[PDB]
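Tutorial sheet, problem 5. The eight components below are modelled jointly, 580 residues in total.
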Amino acid sequence: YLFASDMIQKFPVSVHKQMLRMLCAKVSLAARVDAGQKNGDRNTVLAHKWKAELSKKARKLSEAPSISETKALPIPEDQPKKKRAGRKFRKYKEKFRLSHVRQLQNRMEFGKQEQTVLDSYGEEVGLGMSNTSLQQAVGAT
Amino acid sequence: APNPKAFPLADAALTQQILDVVQQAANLRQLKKGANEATKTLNRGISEFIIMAADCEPIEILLHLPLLCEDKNVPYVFVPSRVALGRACGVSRPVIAASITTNDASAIKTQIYAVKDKIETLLI
Amino acid sequence: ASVLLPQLRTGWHVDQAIVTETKRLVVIRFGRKNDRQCMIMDELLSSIAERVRNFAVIYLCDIDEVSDFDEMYELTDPMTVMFFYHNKHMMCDFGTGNNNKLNFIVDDKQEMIDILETIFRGARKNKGLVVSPYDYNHKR
Amino acid sequence: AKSTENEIPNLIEKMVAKGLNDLVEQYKFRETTHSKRELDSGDDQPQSSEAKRTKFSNPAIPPVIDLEKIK
Amino acid sequence: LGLLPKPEPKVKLSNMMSVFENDQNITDPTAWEKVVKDQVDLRKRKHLEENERRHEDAIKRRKEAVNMNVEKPTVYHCKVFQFKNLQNPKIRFKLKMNSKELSL
RNA sequence: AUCCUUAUGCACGGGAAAUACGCAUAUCAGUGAGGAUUCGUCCGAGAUUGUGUUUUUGCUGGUUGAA
RNA sequence: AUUUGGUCAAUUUGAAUACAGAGAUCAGCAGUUCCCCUGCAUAAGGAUGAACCGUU
RNA sequence: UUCUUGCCUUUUACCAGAAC
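Model answer (structure tokens):
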């Protein structure tokens, strides 16, 4: 029922979820207030305020961020300062190192036709010189 | 100065004690911040006692909770500061209502019970 | 763009611009305001300029207005850009065979940026020349 | 206010120093509130050791004092 | 800028094999081991020592602190219990000592 | 005086991750952020925007070369 | 059927010198965040022990 | 200049045809 209200359904669909949520809570608050009140009081100032707030919220949600001042490319200097290592640090860097098997693969034997693998997606793949010659001749690793 | 309809307002020391309990409750996941959560707790029956805020403005968003408590026979207080309550709960934002809930096996059961007793004494 | 990139008025101004940027590189588009190619270049450079504000400044120049610098291209006068660092003119060997100036529109913003970066690097090294990472040959 | 006037420069740094002091006095829940810091000072008073730790806190909470000393 | 201390590499028995800033790592292998183990012990010992110090200081504080705290009591909780007999010593003792403890 | 629960502060030690961690004169937020759902209801704390670093910060050691 | 896509930069110049352009590689440790354990402190909050009688 | 072929990959200059 609430989602089909004017208060939500006037705004864009971007906002509806958040707007709906807002409405629920404010609606609840309003109800509580009503319950609290005695008959023939009809204050209805709090509700007005809530409505105003809701409207404001809606407006904010519809409005986007002001354009970003295009973040600059850093003054290209080519620093090689770092120079570190550590059981700690060498792990992380291990994830970004080419590992020894990959290095081996990258090596291709000169005369020989190099060991490929036929991935059904693409045969192209070069298993390279990660498999030892004898090993390759026999089988896998 | 605090609202008349915010009743019973807890005495300074008592208030402090309540806050401490809440903090403990927060730590233990025994506590439920906020009007709506508090209301839910009451409905469930899990609420041991309800801690409200005198400086909740507009007060009347609060004032169902007391009624609910009365109808459920649950002790309830107001403390004076919403901000303080929020802090106790572990929320930088103003909290106005909270519920310390039931859990027999809690470390702080005894503390909670004490606070409940105090609250009851306040009521009349 | 007209509004975005600063345009220069007279040869003196241009000279000042070329001199003054000690830290950054200076990209001067020399081009006749209303031409297609020139316009395209300007558009491209608008995009680039904001990105590369930290290492290279862009400026535009109406070549029919400011006739002081027909030393720079021997009175050929297509719609060009020119590169400067520490008042030293910066040579960028594309495929084109005019290493002095890129007298051709490059459509890729990123590519343009890359070339600018390259020339900046060269300047920093002191290398008057630099070989572009993109071959061209076709545009000319 | 009087107390603040005499010893307390009453900036953020000073406040931080004060806070640190109460922690070292042996705090758990954030020491105490500060209406204008006077209350906090009063609370501290039982510990009775105010002036030393603010002269230490500026050496730590930045290193500017240290730098100055060096120079 | 101060150079007041200098930070040495925190060896252990797993770093032992890979630390070479301190010399003697293979040259004097058992010596190296001793050094590293010793260092570890010191670290542990230091921690323990620190804890001990803390314990001491706290203890020192507490006695003083109690003496200091002669606060003005605002309101007093009371409880009165009555019993039919207590010919047991033990109960009496409990009543005594507990009371003494709790300033009751 | 002994034992234990909670939180935090300091630390021994051990482990994982840094595609992670911040920062903001921002905007909004237990007076509901964001989510669940068997649709009855349930959970309940960040979200938005901006931005800084992020194949890393600070420090060491070696071989080496350089020559 | 011809041809352009083919200019080393740098320095000394009023063509000569240069001759492609000027740290690498291996390894620690600490920090940053989160987690777990451990000891201590701080609050709080328990639980429990200990002979035997006390104080105007 | 525009469209279609062929050099092909670009500047001419062309290959070989249309339209203005």
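Marking note: Chain D has five helices and no strands. Full credit if you identified this.
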